[PDB]
């Protein structure tokens, strides 16, 4: 019926996309701002994501208020339907952008954790920066199918857009494929940072654990008076520090080397245990101590805040992952049901929907994840 | 290779002294700590004691403490435990080990090589010639057994045959048991549907013979 | 003080078996745990150093494994070569040295029926002073077994010495000899004596008696 | 031939056995069983490919002894088994 429509149906309320615009304008400017204030190569990711959203949604917008100041649809006010091609291109080309974005996010995260030496080495901004002009290349490439006889636009409307058609042109099947295989890898990503930040927090609850048995067999030590009893905390001490150095950095260099240092000191301190001289031992596990100040504090704050940043940075990715299973499944859903029923059921409507409420969606979450999330890291 | 050779043991009275030595082939002594093991007949292996030739410092363990000896001489590259005021629990089979200092791997491979061993046996008896006493089925009995008890021989190395090695199948021969007095016991039994049991003692220079006969 | 306890203390299997022991440490040890395989009448010799690696020259059949407190030494197949005792040892220290109570490996097979044989002291051995009477256990697979001595339907307790060998090449069958130690006024004033074998694969206890 | 019946008796730090009126296997805490039992049966004793020279009373008996000394006191009453 849209095909043939080619007038502005009475009564349809123009003030969801105004409102739609204005709140995408608006998340935005608060995301532009908020990554303002602040590089590394998630941020930029983030910033150009949003960057790009902002360019669909400032592509997209203009054409439907120019539909309802002139009251015709697509068809009729531009010629053969030029803007409902033109329109329904662009209400792809970013659609398919912004996601592949997203799948870089998920592979930085990989690159970031699953190989830890090939990130360690120097990736600057430039890097980033040249991302962005490729996956726009490659989404430019990948919609520019339709309009060469390959792919057909039809108007699957209420009465102010366009989409692809769904019929012989095989064009919608491949889209939603793609769509499908980038979901499944950012989810396959996803989990694998997960499990791998699993395995990264149970090493330090297990160093934290081996830390404060030294911690506790140091002041036992310190108390004790008796051979025996410094003589066991020095056993279980020493028990304590060869349970720590089993989880090739240069500072994975010392940090062992540090132990080695520490583990050799006990060492003495039970031969001089087994001297019988007390005072000395004691003297040896100030010394332990000292080792312990100058070369294995550091090691675990700096393992702290980073796992800390990852976590967070994890989260951020994973919310925005649902979203966008919340805006494209429905779609890839709609690809492979029957037209006649996609049509029987009016159910491309609601996935197209879907679709556009990711513009709105996908900024302003990020305006929802504020730096005071330590609650959520919480868990 | 690297090669630890002990020396030294044997038998000695209750309340002398012995000097085992273990000697090292293949490496330097003042690079790696020098580990005794002492192992019971019929039990298993216990850590007797350590030196370390690096620092000096010796250790022993709870039970032997202020009895044994350990001392290392880089001249000869060799080991010396002494050994006073001995008991009867002190019947066991020695070995000598290496354990490498803590810096790195060589620490980790714990006793990576194993000595020979030497046998120590503290006893207060004599040695007694092999007492061989026949032992003789009953009348009726299809298959038989003949046996032969020997008794009363102090030193651990006796050979018992039978029909001068020509009959050597069926021939059981049980592990020398300890007396009370601290005389050894073995019994040497054949199963068969003339036949003479030998039993030569290589210390006692003693061969005895005997005849079985059905009862 | 760290006082090592092996559970496995007598296992038996065959060729391709898998074979697991467990070795329990008093405290906790980080990684200060090795295996060592001693033959009988032979040196001990080092298997799996640290728990995870594997010693230079030793097949790869064996495996070491850590979980909490326990280590666990884990062989795929058994081979006429690997059968000898084995020896959880914990190196935490150069003091602290403790070894565990061992695991000998055994050759199973069908279990049979021992053969109870009874001799009683010769001429000779009355002659001597000292009276000794033999009860033998010819071809029991299981080694676990149980022989008591009854003197006039009288049990006796001590002044008996056990010796048990070691498997056959031929078939894994132990032999057992108990050694009954009397004096010449003991034999000649007790009419009878006996021996009574409890062993698994026999319903009754089989009885072997001699009369003066 | 061919049968698959199999047998339950009525534990845990004790050691079970099997008589057949002759050893035919024990349940130890391993378990060993008797020449021709040996790759036949399988011990709850999963009795398969049985053989018409099989057809005789099996009981059960439970070890008292903790060390395995084959002291079985607590036999069972039995139930007959017939094969072909
Ligand atoms: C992908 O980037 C952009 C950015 C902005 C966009 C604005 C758009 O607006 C056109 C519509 C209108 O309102 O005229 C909205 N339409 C609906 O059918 C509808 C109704 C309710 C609802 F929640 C969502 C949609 C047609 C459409 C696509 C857009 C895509």
């Known amino acids: 019926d849209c095909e043939t429509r080619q007038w502005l149906p009475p009564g349809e309320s123009p003030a969801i996309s105004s409102v739609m615009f204005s709140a995408g304008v608006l998340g935005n400017l608060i995301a532009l701002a908020l990554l303002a204030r602040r590089l590394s190569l998630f941020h930029v990711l983030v910033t150009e994501l949003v960057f790009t959203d902002l360019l669909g949604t400032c592509l997209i917008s203009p054409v439907v208020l120019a539909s309802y100041a002139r009251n015709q649809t697509l068809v009729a006010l531009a010629p053969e339907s030029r803007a409902c091609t033109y329109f329904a291109f662009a209400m792809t080309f970013f659609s398919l952008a912004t996601m592949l974005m997203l799948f870089a996010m998920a592979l930085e995260r990989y690159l970031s954790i699953g190989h830890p030496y090939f990130y360690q080495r120097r990736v600057s901004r430039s890097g980033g920066l040249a991302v962005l002009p490729v996956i726009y290349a490659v989404s430019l490439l990948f919609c520019s199918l339709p309009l060469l006889d390959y792919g057909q636009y039809v108007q699957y409307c209420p009465g102010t857009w366009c989409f692809i058609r769904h019929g012989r042109t095989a064009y919608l099947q491949l889209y939603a494929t793609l769509l499908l295989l980038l979901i499944v890898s950012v989810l396959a990503c996803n989990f694998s940072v997960i499990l791998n930040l699993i395995r990264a927090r149970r090493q330090l609850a297990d160093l934290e654990d081996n830390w404060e048995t030294l911690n506790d067999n140091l002041k036992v030590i310190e108390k004790a008076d008796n051979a025996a009893q410094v003589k066991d905390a020095l056993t279980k001490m020493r028990a304590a520090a060869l349970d720590a150095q089993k989880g090739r950095s240069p500072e994975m260099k010392d940090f062992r080397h540090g132990f080695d240092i520490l583990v050799g000191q006990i060492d003495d301190a039970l031969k001089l245990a087994n001297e019988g001289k007390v005072k000395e031992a004691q003297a040896a596990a100030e010394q332990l101590k000292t080792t312990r100040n100058a070369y294995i504090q550091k090691y675990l704050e700096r393992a702290r805040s980073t796992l800390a940043e990852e976590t967070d940075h994890l989260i951020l990715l994973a919310i925005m992952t649902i979203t966008f299973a919340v805006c494209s499944l429905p779609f890839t859903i709609f690809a492979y049901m029957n037209e006649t029923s996609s049509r029987k059921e009016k159910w491309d409507l609601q996935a197209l929907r879907f679709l556009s409420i990711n513009s709105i969606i996908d900024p302003w979450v990020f305006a929802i994840l504020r730096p005071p999330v330590l609650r959520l890291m919480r868990s | 290779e690297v090669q630890l050779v002990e020396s030294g043991g044997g038998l000695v009275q209750p309340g002398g002294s012995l000097r085992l030595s273990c000697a090292a082939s293949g490496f330097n002594v003042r690079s790696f700590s020098i580990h005794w093991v002492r192992q019971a007949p019929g039990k298993g292996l216990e850590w007797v004691a350590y030196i370390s030739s690096s620092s000096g410092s010796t250790s022993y363990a709870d039970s032997v403490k202020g009895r044994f000896t350990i001392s290392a001489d880089t001249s000869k590259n060799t080991a010396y435990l002494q050994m006073n005021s001995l008991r009867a629990e002190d019947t066991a089979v020695y070995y000598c080990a290496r354990w490498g200092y803590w810096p790195g791997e060589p620490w980790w491979k714990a006793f990576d090589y194993w000595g020979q061993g030497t046998l120590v046996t503290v006893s207060s008896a004599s040695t007694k010639g092999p007492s061989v006493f026949p032992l003789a089925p009953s009348s009726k009995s299809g298959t038989a057994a003949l046996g032969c008890l020997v008794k009363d021989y102090f030193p651990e190395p006796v050979t018992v045959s039978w029909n001068s090695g020509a009959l050597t199948s069926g021939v059981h021969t049980f592990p020398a048991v300890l007396q009370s007095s601290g005389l050894y016991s073995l019994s040497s039994v054949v199963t068969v549907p003339t036949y003479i049991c030998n039993v030569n003692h290589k210390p006692s220079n003693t061969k005895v013979d005997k005849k079985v006969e059905p009862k | 003080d760290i006082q090592m306890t092996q559970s496995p203390s007598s296992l038996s299997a065959s060729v391709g078996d898998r074979v697991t022991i467990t070795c329990r440490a008093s405290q906790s040890v980080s990684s200060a745990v090795a295996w060592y395989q001693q033959k009988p009448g032979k040196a001990p010799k080092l298997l799996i150093y640290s728990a995870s690696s594997l010693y230079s020259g030793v097949p790869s059949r064996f495996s070491g494994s850590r979980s909490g407190t326990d280590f666990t030494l884990t062989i795929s197949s058994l081979q006429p070569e690997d059968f000898a005792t084995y020896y959880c040892q914990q190196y935490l220290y150069y003091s602290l040295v403790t070894f565990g109570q061992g695991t000998k490996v055994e050759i199973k097979r069908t279990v049979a029926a021992p053969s109870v044989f009874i001799f009683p002291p010769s001429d000779s051995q009355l002659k001597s002073g000292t009276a000794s009477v033999v009860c033998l256990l010819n071809n029991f697979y299981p080694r676990e077994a149980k022989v008591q001595w009854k003197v006039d339907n009288a049990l006796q307790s001590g002044n008996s010495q056990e010796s048990v060998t070691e498997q056959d090449s031929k078939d894994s069958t132990y032999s057992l000899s108990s050694t009954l130690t009397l004096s010449k006024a003991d034999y000649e004033k007790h009419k009878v004596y006996a021996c009574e074998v409890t062993h698994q694969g026999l319903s009754s206890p089989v009885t072997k008696s001699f009369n003066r | ?84």
């Open chain 4, 1 to 84: 031939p061919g049968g698959s019946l199999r047998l339950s008796c009525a534990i845990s730090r004790y050691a079970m056995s099997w008589f057949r009126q002759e050893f035919v296997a024990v349940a130890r805490r391993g378990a060993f069983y008797a020449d021709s039992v040996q790759g036949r049966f399988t011990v709850y004793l999963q009795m398969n490919s049985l053989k018409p020279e099989d057809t005789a009373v099996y009981y059960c008996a439970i070890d008292s002894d903790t060390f395995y000394s084959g002291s079985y006191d607590y036999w069972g009453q039995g139930t007959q088994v017939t094969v072909s």
